[PDB]
């Protein structure tokens, strides 16, 4: 019944300014209070503020100095500006709308969310090293930013491995790391592949004896 699309830059540096936009395809654009909410990874939700087509706004007081929300009634879009970010601003940011003009501010229409990471680092593709036991083999992805990595494992006779297991990424020193493992019950090796915005990479992982 209503669609909300979001867009905006996903990787920033300390003290730059965050900017996100949300467009509405669907009912009337008119009397609702449209909101911005956000969610740091691992933690819960926090409301930032809201606005209607005629410009009146309401902000959460713990962000009120750094925030500005505004609307464009010419394109049915609204947007959020958050200045001086620091690493605490990293989070998934959603837009949303309440079901009626005349009621509680609870939300039944949401956008899909934009993850925004704030770091001093600079985009970079992983470097890969293998993990052999001194059966289980593994792969280490290191020094990547932002955090969007994907892993896949293949046999030497090209065909997918599926006894696989992957772990969330950890954050050490402005950048990330992540590990993946395969559990196997000739061939002299097996293959570890990762995909990442800054570059796909491969590495053969030797079999132990």
């Amino acid at each position: 019944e209503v669609q909300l699309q979001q867009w905006g830059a996903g990787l920033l540096k300390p003290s730059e300014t965050l900017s996100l936009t949300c467009a509405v395809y669907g009912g009337s654009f008119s009397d609702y209070y449209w909101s911005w909410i956000r969610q740091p990874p691992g933690k819960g939700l926090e409301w930032i503020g809201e606005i209607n087509h005629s410009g009146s706004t309401n902000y959460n007081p713990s962000l009120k100095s750094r925030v500005t929300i505004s609307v464009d009634t010419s394109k049915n879009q609204f947007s959020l500006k958050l200045s001086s970010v620091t690493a605490a601003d990293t989070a998934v940011y959603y837009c949303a709308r309440p079901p009626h003009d005349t009621s509680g501010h609870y939300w039944n229409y949401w956008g899909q969310g934009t993850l925004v990471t704030v770091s001093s680092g600079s985009a970079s593709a992983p470097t890969l090293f293998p993990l052999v036991s001194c059966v289980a083999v593994g792969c280490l992805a290191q020094d990547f930013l932002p955090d969007s990595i994907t892993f896949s494992w293949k046999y030497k006779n090209n065909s997918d491995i599926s006894s696989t297991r992957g772990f969330p990424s950890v954050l050490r020193g402005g950048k990330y790391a992540a590990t993946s493992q395969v559990l196997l019950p000739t061939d002299e090796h097996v293959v570890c592949k990762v995909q990442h915005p800054n570059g796909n990479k491969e590495k053969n992982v030797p079999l132990p004896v």
Partner: protein, 215 residues
Amino acid sequence: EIVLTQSPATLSLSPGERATLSCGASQSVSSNYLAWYQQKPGQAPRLLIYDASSRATGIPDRFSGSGSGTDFTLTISRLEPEDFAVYYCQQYGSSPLTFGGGTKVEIKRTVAAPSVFIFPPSDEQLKSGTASVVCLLNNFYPREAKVQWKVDNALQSGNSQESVTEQDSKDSTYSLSSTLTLSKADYEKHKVYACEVTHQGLSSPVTKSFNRGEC
């Protein structure tokens, strides 16, 4: 702001059981203006109940909500498999609008002790100047497990990171990965590297280790 505190934080039940979750307010909330949402990994929150006890369109009537004042509660009368997830409450009785910390409803199963694996740093990795020693525990339940690192039995501390998976959808267990990170200097400088694991499905801790070199 009104603070909302949800408990428990984790709920282990079985498919078919009944779940009952709490959301306490630190002030009373006007007109029962309280709502509950459901959240699944990587997805936006979905509305279940609004105005403390009305249900949203399409929501099955096993969900029900009651309360008023400063104690609101959510009841799911018969856990079905799609019901396992994270639930939040939210008040809209006064600004700023606020949310509780969420309670996760996990599947209960029979305890299972983990398999442990240890892995030394690669030569390539060593050549670049840092050392990463990796300990891997697989397929355990419940979730709580302690991992302690030992280097020549000198209990390490403040230099390891852990990461946990989501409850697996085949057998409902968890897997965890631990990383000890040293500089090449430091790695070279010692000899026995060990990973020590305690878990309720184990009668005493398990230890896995290797010697620098023989590998």
